[PDB]
Design a binder for this molecule. Structure first.
Ligand SMILES: O=C1Cc2cc(Nc3ncnc(Cl)c3Cl)ccc2N1
Ligand SMILES: O=C1Cc2cc(Nc3ncnc(Cl)c3Cl)ccc2N1
Ligand SMILES: [Cl-]
Ligand SMILES: [Cl-]
Lengths: 124, 4, 124, 4
């Protein structure tokens, strides 16, 4: 086509989606990670995670308002990944990298799994 | 704005 | 913070949101523009438009499944702007620029209004 | 990935 493109559009959309999440606006699901609960938008979770994409395209699970993750999932690792979904920024630290990588593998977030593998390899 |  | 950032994350999210729109997955509103109907995600519309942001934060309108736009709104101009919301690409042509600018002013999409004003000024 |  002969379209023009606004460079900052995708980033501006994601920024506003994070503002709606922070104010709990039109969030339609709560993700339960052991004792912790995280409110989010199903569409953003599906857009970021192969696991959520599979869950919310399922004809019965698409209608659930609560999703319980596997008890081995670390709430902090999930929190870091949810923040990444809504911002493009990943808070990867020596103290959380193992939990972040395991959570990213479970959530099927291949680019996160890749940078965790590389950061771990450099420390070996 | 750019030509993509 | 000491976060790392994935450059293509926002663009990848928007691409997946457009894929969900194309397959009519988790769309929660229909925008009526005279004889034409457009299915979308309320969160994406709010993230792109000052008008939709105001509509869907309203305590009664947030729950509506159908929104009727002003009868002066051109369906093609709306279609072009909805495509822009979900892709960052604007199909701006001599034959549609007036309708696109008027629709962008109504929808409160200031960056689109700006490029339309500039493209019109160059042709004068 | 970059340092933002
Ligand atoms: O590493 C990742 C990130 C990811 C996201 C999704 N999401 C979607 N993919 C294709 N079409 C659609 Cl419609 C969506 Cl929402 C699926 C798989 C994966 N894997
Ligand atoms: O030209 C534009 C594009 C636009 C989008 C929105 N959206 C939001 N703004 C602030 N916080 C939130 Cl939560 C959202 Cl969703 C509001 C005004 C405008 N004007
Ligand atoms: Cl990822
Ligand atoms: Cl805009």
């Amino acid at each position: 086509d002969s379209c023009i493109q606004f460079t900052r559009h995708a980033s501006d959309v994601l920024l506003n989606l994070n503002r709606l999440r922070s104010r709990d606006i039109l969030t339609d699901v709560v993700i339960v990670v052991s004792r912790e609960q995280f409110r989010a938008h199903k569409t953003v979770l599906m857009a970021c995670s192969g696991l959520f994409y599979s869950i919310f395209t399922d004809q019965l699970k698409c209608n659930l308002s609560v999703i319980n993750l596997d008890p081995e999932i670390n709430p902090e690792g999930f929190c870091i990944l949810l923040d990444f979904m809504y911002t493009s920024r990943l808070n990867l630290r020596e103290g959380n990298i193992m939990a972040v990588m395991a959570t990213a593998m479970y959530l099927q977030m291949e680019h996160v799994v890749d940078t965790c593998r590389k950061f771990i390899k450099a420390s070996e | 704005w750019v030509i993509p």
